[PDB]
UniProtKB/Swiss-Prot annotation, chain B:
Modified residues (N6-methyllysine): 1
Name this polypeptide is given: Histone H4
GO molecular function: DNA binding; protein heterodimerization activity; structural constituent of chromatin
PTM statement from Swiss-Prot or TrEMBL: Demethylation is performed by JMJD6. Monomethylated, dimethylated or trimethylated at Lys-1 (H4K20me1, H4K20me2, H4K20me3). Monomethylation is performed by KMT5A/SET8. Trimethylation is performed by KMT5B and KMT5C and induces gene silencing.
Organism of this sequence: Xenopus laevis (African clawed frog)
UniProt-annotated location(s): Nucleus; Chromosome
UniProt keyword annotations, A-Z: Acetylation, Chromosome, Citrullination, DNA-binding, Hydroxylation, Isopeptide bond, Methylation, Nucleosome core, Nucleus, Phosphoprotein, Ubl conjugation
Curated annotation (Swiss-Prot), chain C:
Biological process annotations from GO: cellular response to stress; chromatin organization; DNA replication-dependent chromatin assembly; negative regulation of DNA damage checkpoint; nucleosome assembly; nucleosome disassembly; positive regulation of transcription elongation by RNA polymerase II; protein modification process
Interaction with HIR1, as annotated region: 2-143
Consequence when changing residue 37 to R: Reduces transcriptional silencing
Subunit structure: Interacts with histone H3/H4 heterodimers via both histone H3 and histone H4. Binds with higher affinity to H3/H4 heterodimers where histone H3 has been pre-acetylated on 'Lys-14'. Interacts with RAD53 and this may impair interaction with histones and chromatin assembly; the interaction is reduced upon activation of DNA damage or replication checkpoints which in turn promotes histone binding and chromatin assembly. Interacts with the CAC2 subunit of chromatin assembly factor 1 (CAF-1). Interacts with the HIR1, HIR2, HIR3 and HPC2 subunits of the HIR complex.
Function per UniProt: Histone chaperone that facilitates histone deposition and histone exchange and removal during nucleosome assembly and disassembly. Facilitates histone deposition through both replication-dependent and replication-independent chromatin assembly pathways. Cooperates with chromatin assembly factor 1 (CAF-1) to promote replication-dependent chromatin assembly and with the HIR complex to promote replication-independent chromatin assembly, which may occur during transcription and DNA repair.
Residue ranges, annotated region (Interaction with histone H3, histone H4, RAD53 and the RF-C complex): 2-155
Localisation: Nucleus
Additional free-text comment from the UniProt record: Present with 6230 molecules/cell in log phase SD medium.
Protein's recorded name: Histone chaperone ASF1
Top-level taxon of the source organism: Eukaryota
Effect of residue 39 to R: Reduces transcriptional silencing
Gene designation: ASF1
Taxonomic placement: Eukaryota, Fungi, Dikarya, Ascomycota, Saccharomycotina
Annotated GO MF terms: acetyltransferase activator activity; histone binding
Cellular component, GO annotation: chromatin; chromosome, telomeric region; cytosol; H3 histone acetyltransferase complex; nucleus
């Protein structure tokens, strides 16, 4: 919905290529990854905004995104 | 460095929509590249696992079931201890 | 399905000086006898740019784990300012309170921590040489970000078919 499908599907294909040649995703699998990517990034932005607010800033910065990746679990 | 390295899966307007959806009001211009980098790590981790399950099932086609399970590895994050 | 669950955390002394210890009270539940150890770690993120600047502040290793509700306190020494990139010292960061069982991480709690000078003059014109004694930290205690991982709890009772 927020992400357009075809460029997203190409990225998925390129990434999957680095793991195993000649391997397609079912349309439902790509859709599942898209929906999950949207949910992941929305949640990351929620934490990112919180970080900025706590820093007394109204503008999010790359540091806020990296810290949100630590505040949610990292790995 | 080369074209393949710079292939993207989310556009700049999409990044802005996702940011608004997450409650963001203003952004550094450096946020587009940052967000793209974070997305690529997320997808590499999930797809790596999805592919492992597909291979063990003697398949060449990745299914939603492989993706759904791979997506559990990130854990479940909430506010508070409920 | 988790044998051990975090029930709550209290951030006890907040706001505080940068050099003050971190006081926490942690409460958790253990549903049944476990063979191995739990370890709670407290980690301060020295830089958002790299894990290289993480400072582990404290650890409590418990084993065996008593069944029922358990409580403990950290009074953890603060991070070393000398080990933090000076440009990232008086700025927001995160602290992370985690727990593992038999070496398998099952819960992580992250808090934002703002660091700000306690004088208008310094806040307006922060000196190149940081003045640690004037830094006040403020943990966002009302918004812990709690992440749970579904782990295997009893290697005799359950098997992961894709172990690491
Ligand atoms: Zn002074």
């Amino acid at each position: 919905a927020l992400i357009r499908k075809l460029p997203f599907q190409r990225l998925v294909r390129e990434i999957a290529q680095d793991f195993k040649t000649d391997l397609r995703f079912q349309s439902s699998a790509v859709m599942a990854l898209q929906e999950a990517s949207e949910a992941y990034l929305v949640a990351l932005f929620e934490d990112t905004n919180l970080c900025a607010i706590h820093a007394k800033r109204v503008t999010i910065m790359p540091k806020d995104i990296q810290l949100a990746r630590r505040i949610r679990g990292e790995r | 460095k080369v074209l393949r390295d710079n292939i993207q899966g989310i556009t700049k307007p999409a990044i802005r929509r996702l940011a608004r959806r997450g409650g963001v009001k203003r952004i550094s211009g450096l946020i587009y590249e940052e967000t793209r980098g974070v997305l690529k790590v997320f997808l590499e981790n999930v797809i790596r696992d999805a592919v492992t399950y597909t291979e063990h099932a003697k398949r060449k086609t990745v299914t939603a079931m492989d993706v759904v399970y791979a997506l559990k590895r990130q854990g479940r994050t909430l506010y508070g201890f409920g | 399905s988790s044998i051990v669950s975090l029930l709550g955390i209290k951030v006890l002394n907040n706001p505080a000086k940068f050099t003050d210890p971190y006081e926490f009270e942690i409460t958790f539940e253990c549903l049944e006898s476990l063979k191995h150890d739990l370890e709670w770690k407290l980690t301060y993120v020295g830089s958002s740019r790299s894990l290289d600047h993480d400072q582990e502040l404290d650890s409590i290793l418990v084993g065996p784990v008593p069944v029922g509700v358990n409580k403990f306190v950290f009074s953890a020494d603060p991070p070393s300012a000398e080990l933090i990139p000076a440009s990232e010292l008086v700025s927001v960061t995160v602290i992370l309170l985690s727990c593992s069982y038999d070496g398998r991480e099952f819960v992580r709690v992250g808090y934002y921590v703002n660091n700000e000078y306690d004088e208008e003059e310094l806040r307006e014109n922060p000196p190149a040489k940081v003045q640690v004694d004037h830094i006040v930290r403020n943990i966002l205690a009302e918004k812990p970000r709690v992440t749970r991982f579904n782990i295997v709890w009893d290697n005799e009772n359950e098997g992961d078919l894709y172990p690491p």
